[PDB]
Amino acid sequence: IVGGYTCGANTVPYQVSLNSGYHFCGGSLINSQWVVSAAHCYKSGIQVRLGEDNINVVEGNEQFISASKSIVHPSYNSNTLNNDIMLIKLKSAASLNSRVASISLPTSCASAGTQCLISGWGNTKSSGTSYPDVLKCLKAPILSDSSCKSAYPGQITSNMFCAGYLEGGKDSCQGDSGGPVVCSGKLQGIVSWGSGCAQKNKPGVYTKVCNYVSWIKQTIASN
Ligand SMILES: N=C(N)c1ccc(/C=N/c2ccc(Br)cc2)cc1
Numbered sequence: 001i002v003g004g005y006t007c008g009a010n011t012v013p014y015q016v017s018l019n020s021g022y023h024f025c026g027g028s029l030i031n032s033q034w035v036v037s038a039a040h041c042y043k044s045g046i047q048v049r050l051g052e053d054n055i056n057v058v059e060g061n062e063q064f065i066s067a068s069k070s071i072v073h074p075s076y077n078s079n080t081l082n083n084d085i086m087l088i089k090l091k092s093a094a095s096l097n098s099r100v101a102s103i104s105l106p107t108s109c110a111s112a113g114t115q116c117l118i119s120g121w122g123n124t125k126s127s128g129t130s131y132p133d134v135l136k137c138l139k140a141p142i143l144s145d146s147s148c149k150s151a152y153p154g155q156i157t158s159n160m161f162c163a164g165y166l167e168g169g170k171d172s173c174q175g176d177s178g179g180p181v182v183c184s185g186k187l188q189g190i191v192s193w194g195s196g197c198a199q200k201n202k203p204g205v206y207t208k209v210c211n212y213v214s215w216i217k218q219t220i221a222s223n
């Protein structure tokens with residue numbers, strides 16, 4: 001997260017860190033046994049880390065639970081990043097509490113102008129590299145489909161939306177991949193892509209979760 005703020009320990013209780021020896025992606029806890037992330041976060045050997053603030057220090061509220069299975073969206077295209085969504089099942093159910101909590105799926109798609117919260121442990125610099133140990137947060141509006149398409153001609157599908165600031169300086173970044181965009185207490189987006197980070201006229205692009213609610217629910221019901 002570039003140009004954001006320190007969230008505060010366990011203030012984003014649905015935020016998870018995916019760890020394969022090291023943090024490599026965020027995700028969102030959607031019930032006691034399932035996490036939503038980006039398809040481009042797929043790899044084997046995933047441990048889900050819940051209740052994290054400082055990902056380098058055991059602070060006392062963590063739950064570390066290995067994934068039993070990952071399900072990448074059947075229509076995920078790694079070239080275009082269309083359908084950039086995946087589900088990860090925990091080997092055992094997380095213990096839910098004030099600091100480890102699921103986030104609701106949307107009942108309807110959020111509109112341009114809606115203020116959302118984007119969070120992650122990704123790079124905090126737009127040029128160069130600095131990775132924070134603690135969770136970073138950014139409040140950002142959903143942008144119009146037209147401004148999104150204008151920023152990224154030929155690249156925005158019906159399964160993507162832009163959020164952030166055309167002026168630049170505030171954005172998600174590498175390492176935030178797979179993490180949440182939450183608007184009015186609903187998971188509306190997943191950190192997916194962008195040209196660099198926090199660049200003028202290159203806002204963040206997010207997987208449009210509201211298009212996947214049926215797939216998510218049906219997949220969970222049978223797996
Ligand atoms: N500016 C942004 N909001 C932004 C930029 C880049 C990313 C990560 N992008 C990747 C996508 C696919 C792979 Br594989 C590796 C990295 C995420 C967000």
Ligand SMILES: [Ca+2]
Nearest residue numbers: 054055057058
């Ligand atoms: Ca920790």
